[PDB]
Design an enzyme around this catalytic site. Sequence first.
Site, PDB file in Angstrom:
ATOM      1  N   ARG A  64       1.852  -6.040   9.686  1.00  0.00           N
ATOM      2  CA  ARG A  64       1.040  -4.936  10.188  1.00  0.00           C
ATOM      3  C   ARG A  64       1.390  -4.665  11.646  1.00  0.00           C
ATOM      4  NH1 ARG A  64      -4.750  -6.874   7.535  1.00  0.00           N
ATOM      5  NH2 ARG A  64      -4.413  -5.875   5.490  1.00  0.00           N
ATOM      6  N   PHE A  76     -16.622   3.259   5.214  1.00  0.00           N
ATOM      7  CA  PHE A  76     -15.242   3.608   4.888  1.00  0.00           C
ATOM      8  C   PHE A  76     -14.815   3.355   3.445  1.00  0.00           C
ATOM      9  CE2 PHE A  76     -15.315  -0.759   6.428  1.00  0.00           C
ATOM     10  CZ  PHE A  76     -14.542  -1.433   5.486  1.00  0.00           C
ATOM     11  N   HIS A 134      -1.952  -5.424   1.574  1.00  0.00           N
ATOM     12  CA  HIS A 134      -3.198  -6.130   1.306  1.00  0.00           C
ATOM     13  C   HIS A 134      -2.791  -7.556   0.948  1.00  0.00           C
ATOM     14  CE1 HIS A 134      -6.895  -7.489  -0.699  1.00  0.00           C
ATOM     15  NE2 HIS A 134      -6.050  -8.052  -1.544  1.00  0.00           N
ATOM     16  N   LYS A 165       0.757  -1.247   0.000  1.00  0.00           N
ATOM     17  CA  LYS A 165       0.000   0.000   0.000  1.00  0.00           C
ATOM     18  C   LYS A 165       0.793   1.307   0.000  1.00  0.00           C
ATOM     19  CE  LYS A 165      -4.017  -2.334   1.995  1.00  0.00           C
ATOM     20  NZ  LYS A 165      -5.063  -2.320   3.058  1.00  0.00           N
ATOM     21  N   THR A 198      -6.381  -6.586  10.632  1.00  0.00           N
ATOM     22  CA  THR A 198      -6.685  -5.430   9.792  1.00  0.00           C
ATOM     23  C   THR A 198      -6.266  -4.109  10.442  1.00  0.00           C
ATOM     24  OG1 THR A 198      -8.597  -6.626   8.901  1.00  0.00           O
ATOM     25  CG2 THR A 198      -8.481  -4.258   8.465  1.00  0.00           C
ATOM     26  N   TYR A 210     -11.734  -3.716  -4.377  1.00  0.00           N
ATOM     27  CA  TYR A 210     -12.440  -3.672  -3.095  1.00  0.00           C
ATOM     28  C   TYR A 210     -13.958  -3.665  -3.235  1.00  0.00           C
ATOM     29  CZ  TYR A 210      -8.145  -2.662  -0.409  1.00  0.00           C
ATOM     30  OH  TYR A 210      -6.937  -2.703   0.249  1.00  0.00           O
ATOM     31  N   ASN A 266      -2.727   0.144   6.781  1.00  0.00           N
ATOM     32  CA  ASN A 266      -2.081  -1.046   7.325  1.00  0.00           C
ATOM     33  C   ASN A 266      -1.013  -1.747   6.480  1.00  0.00           C
ATOM     34  OD1 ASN A 266      -3.903  -2.177   5.508  1.00  0.00           O
ATOM     35  ND2 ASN A 266      -5.323  -2.863   7.112  1.00  0.00           N
ATOM     36  N   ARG A 268      -1.707 -14.226   4.803  1.00  0.00           N
ATOM     37  CA  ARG A 268      -2.711 -13.575   5.646  1.00  0.00           C
ATOM     38  C   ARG A 268      -2.219 -13.616   7.090  1.00  0.00           C
ATOM     39  NH1 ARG A 268      -7.168 -10.469   4.416  1.00  0.00           N
ATOM     40  NH2 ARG A 268      -8.639 -11.683   5.698  1.00  0.00           N
ATOM     41  N   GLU A 313      -8.297 -11.316  -8.023  1.00  0.00           N
ATOM     42  CA  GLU A 313      -7.440 -10.148  -7.876  1.00  0.00           C
ATOM     43  C   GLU A 313      -6.213 -10.171  -8.788  1.00  0.00           C
ATOM     44  OE1 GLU A 313      -6.676 -10.001  -3.695  1.00  0.00           O
ATOM     45  OE2 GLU A 313      -8.810  -9.747  -3.215  1.00  0.00           O
TER      46      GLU A 313
HETATM   47  N1  LIG Z   1     -13.591   0.116   9.728  1.00  0.00           N
HETATM   48  C1  LIG Z   1     -12.695   0.564   8.854  1.00  0.00           C
HETATM   49  N2  LIG Z   1     -12.516   1.882   8.680  1.00  0.00           N
HETATM   50  C2  LIG Z   1     -11.646   2.344   7.800  1.00  0.00           C
HETATM   51  N3  LIG Z   1     -10.918   1.531   7.055  1.00  0.00           N
HETATM   52  C3  LIG Z   1     -11.044   0.201   7.173  1.00  0.00           C
HETATM   53  C4  LIG Z   1     -11.945  -0.322   8.090  1.00  0.00           C
HETATM   54  N4  LIG Z   1     -11.874  -1.647   8.006  1.00  0.00           N
HETATM   55  C5  LIG Z   1     -10.972  -1.949   7.073  1.00  0.00           C
HETATM   56  N5  LIG Z   1     -10.470  -0.829   6.558  1.00  0.00           N
HETATM   57  C6  LIG Z   1      -9.512  -0.723   5.432  1.00  0.00           C
HETATM   58  O1  LIG Z   1     -10.080  -1.462   4.335  1.00  0.00           O
HETATM   59  C7  LIG Z   1      -9.160  -2.510   3.983  1.00  0.00           C
HETATM   60  C8  LIG Z   1      -9.890  -3.761   3.491  1.00  0.00           C
HETATM   61  O2  LIG Z   1     -10.825  -4.201   4.481  1.00  0.00           O
HETATM   62  P1  LIG Z   1     -10.847  -5.736   4.970  1.00  0.00           P
HETATM   63  O3  LIG Z   1     -10.799  -6.625   3.787  1.00  0.00           O
HETATM   64  O4  LIG Z   1     -11.958  -5.912   5.933  1.00  0.00           O
HETATM   65  O5  LIG Z   1      -9.455  -5.876   5.770  1.00  0.00           O
HETATM   66  P2  LIG Z   1      -8.258  -6.839   5.279  1.00  0.00           P
HETATM   67  O6  LIG Z   1      -7.296  -5.924   4.369  1.00  0.00           O
HETATM   68  O7  LIG Z   1      -7.400  -7.190   6.595  1.00  0.00           O
HETATM   69  O8  LIG Z   1      -8.739  -8.054   4.585  1.00  0.00           O
HETATM   70  C9  LIG Z   1      -8.411  -2.811   5.279  1.00  0.00           C
HETATM   71  O9  LIG Z   1      -7.165  -3.429   4.947  1.00  0.00           O
HETATM   72  C10 LIG Z   1      -8.160  -1.375   5.733  1.00  0.00           C
HETATM   73  O10 LIG Z   1      -7.152  -0.782   4.910  1.00  0.00           O
HETATM   74 MG   LIG Z   2      -9.861  -8.058   2.545  1.00  0.00          MG
END
Ligand SMILES: Nc1ncnc2c1ncn2[C@@H]1O[C@H](COP(=O)(O)OP(=O)(O)O)[C@@H](O)[C@H]1O
Ligand SMILES: [Mg+2]
Lengths: 155, 154, 154, 155, 154, 155
Positions: free
Chosen positions: C104, C59, C120, C11, C93, C51, C117, C87, C131
């Site tokens: 992370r 968000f 991805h 990222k 997250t 996404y 974070n 993962r 993806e």
């Molecule tokens: N509640 C939130 N508020 C703001 N940003 C978020 C939130 N939850 C997740 N994110 C962002 O959106 C990305 C994708 O969401 P998610 O797939 O749930 O997490 P992950 O990347 O760990 O799989 C997260 O990596 C983070 O960058």
């Molecule tokens: Mg995800």
Amino acid sequence: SETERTLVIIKPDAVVRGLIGEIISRFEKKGLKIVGMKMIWIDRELAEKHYEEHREKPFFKALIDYITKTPVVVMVLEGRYAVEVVRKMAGATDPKDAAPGTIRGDFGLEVSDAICNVIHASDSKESAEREISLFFKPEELFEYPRAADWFYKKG
Amino acid sequence: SETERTLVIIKPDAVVRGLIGEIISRFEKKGLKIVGMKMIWIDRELAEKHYEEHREKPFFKALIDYITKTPVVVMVLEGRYAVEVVRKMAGATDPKDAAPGTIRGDFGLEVSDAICNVIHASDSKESAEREISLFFKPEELFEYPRAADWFYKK
Amino acid sequence: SETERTLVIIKPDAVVRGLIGEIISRFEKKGLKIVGMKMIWIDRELAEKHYEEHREKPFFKALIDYITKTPVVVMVLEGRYAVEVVRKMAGATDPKDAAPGTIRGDFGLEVSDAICNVIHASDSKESAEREISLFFKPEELFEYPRAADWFYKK
Amino acid sequence: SETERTLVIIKPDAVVRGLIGEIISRFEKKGLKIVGMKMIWIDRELAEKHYEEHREKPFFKALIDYITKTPVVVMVLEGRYAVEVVRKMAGATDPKDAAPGTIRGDFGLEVSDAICNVIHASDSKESAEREISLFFKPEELFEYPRAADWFYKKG
Amino acid sequence: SETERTLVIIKPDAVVRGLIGEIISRFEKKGLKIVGMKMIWIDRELAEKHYEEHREKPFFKALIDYITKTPVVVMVLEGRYAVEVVRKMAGATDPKDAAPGTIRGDFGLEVSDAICNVIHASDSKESAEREISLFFKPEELFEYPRAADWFYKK
Amino acid sequence: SETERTLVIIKPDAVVRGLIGEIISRFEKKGLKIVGMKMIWIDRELAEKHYEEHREKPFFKALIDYITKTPVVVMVLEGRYAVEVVRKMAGATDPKDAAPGTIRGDFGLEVSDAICNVIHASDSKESAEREISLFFKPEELFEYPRAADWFYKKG
Ligand SMILES: Nc1ncnc2c1ncn2[C@@H]1O[C@H](COP(=O)(O)OP(=O)(O)O)[C@@H](O)[C@H]1O
Ligand SMILES: [Mg+2]
Ligand SMILES: Nc1ncnc2c1ncn2[C@@H]1O[C@H](COP(=O)(O)OP(=O)(O)O)[C@@H](O)[C@H]1O
Ligand SMILES: Nc1ncnc2c1ncn2[C@@H]1O[C@H](COP(=O)(O)OP(=O)(O)O)[C@@H](O)[C@H]1O
Ligand SMILES: Nc1ncnc2c1ncn2[C@@H]1O[C@H](COP(=O)(O)OP(=O)(O)O)[C@@H](O)[C@H]1O
Ligand SMILES: Nc1ncnc2c1ncn2[C@@H]1O[C@H](COP(=O)(O)OP(=O)(O)O)[C@@H](O)[C@H]1O
Ligand SMILES: Nc1ncnc2c1ncn2[C@@H]1O[C@H](COP(=O)(O)OP(=O)(O)O)[C@@H](O)[C@H]1O
Ligand SMILES: [Cl-]
Ligand SMILES: [Cl-]
Ligand SMILES: [Cl-]
Ligand SMILES: [Cl-]
Ligand SMILES: [Cl-]
Ligand SMILES: [Cl-]
Ligand SMILES: [Cl-]
Ligand SMILES: [Cl-]
Ligand SMILES: [Cl-]
Ligand SMILES: [Cl-]
Ligand SMILES: [Cl-]
Ligand SMILES: [Cl-]
Ligand SMILES: [Mg+2]
Ligand SMILES: [Mg+2]
Ligand SMILES: [Mg+2]
Ligand SMILES: [Mg+2]
Ligand SMILES: [Mg+2]
């Protein structure tokens, strides 16, 4: 063949300071192969034999006490021009003079009556052969492939 | 006494990949003392004595082939509760399940017919005693001070 | 087959902070193989496809602004159970909840309107497939031997 | 402007040995900005074009086989006097001669028919421009701020 | 506000072993900001105020001897949920129980009559406030931008 | 005695980039002892006093703005020939010229109106003494044993 074997000694100061791993990694990372290695406690006789060329020098006694102070790790490194290469990696005898990036340059500085300099490296192919013999038996040296060995084969 | 000794084997996969120094550094940095160490090439007979507990398991033969594939580095680490500590540092048997931060977790993953996992660590004080006698003579084990030993003494 | 491919995105926050190499090294050290990689600058359209699952969340917009803030490095990692492993290496997250030792956990903390974070990682073999097709053409994915591949073959 | 862009190639030996990350970190740590980067598999034609100046040399063929052995990672580094700086970081062509601290000095040693030396770096601004063009399209190079960029602004 | 400050003490064992820089780097890499720091030699009076909560415990005296053994480095770290984050990074009080990846987990093990564990970290926002006032004057605490601060601002 | 004390300043660029720890570790690893250290925010007066020898130079003003831009970490290092040793570890003034392996060589490159070079190191024993006095009171410097100190005692 450009492939040579040199004798390396991780001296008492490096062992006591817990630098054994960091030193070994530098050689592994360089691509040098560890064909022999073991922790031993050098006694006077063996020490004076290894440093035979310095028996008639003023700092001899201090050197013997130093190299026999605690156990050391002796190892044999194999690789292209390993003798000169490992000497370059070691750095200047007095660590204060060793360039940053070298083992002595990065790890050594303080001294006792002996110039404590982290490790020992054979200065020549002749010295390497004589030194390897003092610490290792043929049965303690091995022939085996390192990960990337296949990559360097000359078709 | 809380000070105990454990036997660690830096396996063929670790040797081949050039990870000996990195693994050793983790122990030195933890405060563990190397009181014995040497590169050797284990043969089937010695390997089976070491892994006697697995003789009746399906993966036994493959495990013996694995540990005897190339030379290894056997070493004895000494320190407060050294056995459980090193086991903790090593991580789960299967590298994919080992937590990030552990040796198997950070360095292991790929496998053969045997679960390749960078290193071996005694599972108890009793086993360490047995395994140490298997690889070392008393004359190959040393007692000496590490730099900071004095700091902990009363 | 246990060998699978997963898609990782280093990222914008990781790129800006100069952590690309450190992150890549963690995978290389684990034994994971980089079979594809490139620095690109994702636009809103591509970002939203990636996404898609979050389109209905509060968000979403901030997440799209975040991932498209600066260029990123998208790469495909191959290895035994690569998906769950990466993962696991990534961590929770929210960086503040990620365990020390994870990517992370060690590198992330500060956030914007999006939870920044570092990286991805695909959440399943199915998602990785999707993806990967989103960012790479077959001609950008390679099959070659890593140094120690031979060690694991029978 | 002192700001220059140079072309770096993480050769097959570094890729196979899993050294991509360690090499990239050295540049990032130095303060150099990665404006372009991608993993590709160089074919003969492109390789002979990149190394055009060596087409009439004895080791040419070995060099081509070497640089096209496995995929490589090509990248464009941007920063103050980047061309000379990255060359200094690379170290001597033959890694056995490279000083400890340099990329080749710390990572290279073994060779095949070609002098395997971990990475490639443009030798001049002219070479950099020609080389960057062979591997990257303008659309693959980016302009963006790195964390500390604001710190160096000249008021 | 999620941004908070916590007080960390790099203990005598860490100082003596030359781990100050490594410990500091873990925080810098996490994104935490050093807003105050200095090497000092704590005396019994100041030490007891800091560890007031343990005055009635068997190990109190030994803890005071330990923290005052050699100079230490006291520093204030600022960042999102800095208190719980640093506590998480530190690990279990007894190093042998601390997980690999944490500071105590990777660097601690040996003990004296006190459980030597590399560093101290405030256990709450309230305690950090108290501990910071114990070691620093307002003029020793600074507000300045870290390289990537701008990335997170809206 | 060969034991000397030198004054080191981790300049604003290193602090902002989060390099404080990495720099300190290099000295600790070398065997140098940190007898004094603290984060402060240098003001114009103190800065112009520290760099008094450059008051009549063209780049003076830029240097003052640079060294006072953000808080810095000043520290006193003690060890055998510490002054020359730390200078060697620092590397060439302009980081682009600093050798790989040195602090400036590995971490510095970009510049503003001032030649941002990660850290400052006293150039002589005389400078060290004058500089240490400007930043540290005797009460802020300590005498204590580092882990391996006992190893170097001269029987
Ligand atoms: N509640 C939130 N508020 C703001 N940003 C978020 C939130 N939850 C997740 N994110 C962002 O959106 C990305 C994708 O969401 P998610 O797939 O749930 O997490 P992950 O990347 O760990 O799989 C997260 O990596 C983070 O960058
Ligand atoms: Mg995800
Ligand atoms: N003048 C000296 N005084 C004290 N000790 C010395 C002196 N010279 C060398 N030594 C010690 O003896 C060792 C062997 O000496 P020498 O062969 O000259 O160094 P090198 O390791 O570079 O080959 C040195 O590494 C150092 O440990
Ligand atoms: N089910 C399995 N299949 C193949 N190999 C295995 C299996 N289980 C364990 N192994 C291998 O045998 C070694 C010894 O087994 P065990 O003692 O159960 O694991 P550990 O080394 O974690 O104590 C393991 O380290 C691994 O190398
Ligand atoms: N004499 C040689 N024999 C085999 N390979 C060589 C030889 N010289 C150079 N090479 C290979 O060709 C590459 C390009 O050559 P050259 O431009 O001279 O080196 P450099 O990378 O320092 O610019 C070298 O990096 C190395 O990979
Ligand atoms: N049972 C114990 N015996 C000796 N020393 C202890 C004991 N428990 C804790 N300590 C020491 O006292 C310090 C402070 O205690 P406590 O606040 O409970 O731990 P923590 O530092 O993890 O918050 C611990 O960090 C450790 O140095
Ligand atoms: N010509 C210059 N232009 C701008 N800044 C400079 C110049 N020369 C030196 N500086 C800055 O002033 C500092 C002090 O100068 P000098 O003492 O010559 O360098 P050194 O740190 O190697 O002793 C340098 O470290 C650098 O930060
Ligand atoms: Cl040198
Ligand atoms: Cl290898
Ligand atoms: Cl685990
Ligand atoms: Cl120690
Ligand atoms: Cl986690
Ligand atoms: Cl590999
Ligand atoms: Cl060089
Ligand atoms: Cl940056
Ligand atoms: Cl823990
Ligand atoms: Cl930052
Ligand atoms: Cl230099
Ligand atoms: Cl020490
Ligand atoms: Mg000699
Ligand atoms: Mg077992
Ligand atoms: Mg060239
Ligand atoms: Mg507490
Ligand atoms: Mg000067």
